[PDB]
Design a binder for this molecule. Structure first.
Ligand SMILES: Nc1ncnc2c1ncn2[C@@H]1O[C@H](COP(=O)(O)OP(=O)(O)O)[C@@H](O)[C@H]1OP(=O)(O)O
Ligand SMILES: CCc1nc(N)nc(N)c1-c1ccc(Cl)cc1
Length: 161
């Protein structure tokens, strides 16, 4: 067990998901997600696993871990753990969602890698929302850049002891 990180992409408001979908199209965030997580362990909740397309899961080049209370759960190509702490035995672990897993994982986390999408989506009932940090987290909020489509985004890299 070692470094636990959270990785997510949010609208400025904190929305990460609405209606079961990512609320924007941003291939550069796909590339950023891949570059942060490749070669490491990724942890997701069972509902997140179930949402992925059958031919996309497990995400290649990473040790995929699915958290579930169901010992019989089938997650072909991944491992299933029944507690989060077991999900963090790896030397470097990125939690990728969803909200229940972020909330369990936040107390272990010492790094967050965030993509802020410049899009105005005030929160609505039902939205999936980003984890909330505080003034004990510190680090770099990067400059805005345009994606190829013109959607603007910037990157946060935060840490704590
Ligand atoms: N404390 C816990 N221990 C074990 N599994 C847990 C857990 N909290 C959440 N989970 C699992 O993680 C699932 C939630 O996945 P998620 O975090 O991707 O969902 P959501 O996106 O809806 O927040 C839960 O339904 C549960 O899986 P099962 O329903 O298969 O048991
Ligand atoms: C590429 C989307 C993405 N972007 C960032 N920045 N973080 C993430 N956690 C995800 C993501 C969420 C759920 C799954 Cl299943 C896979 C990836």
């Amino acid at each position: 067990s070692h470094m636990v990180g959270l990785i997510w992409a949010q609208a400025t408001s904190g929305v990460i998901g609405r209606g079961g979908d990512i609320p924007w199209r941003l291939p550069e965030d796909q590339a950023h997600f891949r570059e942060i997580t490749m070669g490491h362990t990724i942890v997701m909740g069972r509902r997140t696993w179930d949402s992925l397309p059958a031919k996309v899961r497990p995400l290649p080049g990473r040790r995929n871990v699915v958290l579930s209370r169901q010992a019989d759960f089938m997650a072909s190509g991944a491992e299933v753990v029944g507690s989060l702490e077991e999900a963090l035995t790896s030397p470097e672990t990125w939690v990728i969602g969803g909200g229940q897993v972020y909330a369990l994982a936040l107390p272990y986390a010492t790094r967050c890698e965030v993509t802020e999408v410049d899009i105005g989506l005030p929160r609505e009932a039902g939205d999936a929302l980003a984890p909330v940090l505080d003034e004990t987290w510190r680090g770099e909020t990067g400059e805005w850049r345009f994606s190829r489509s013109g959607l603007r985004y910037r990157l946060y890299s935060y840490h704590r002891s």
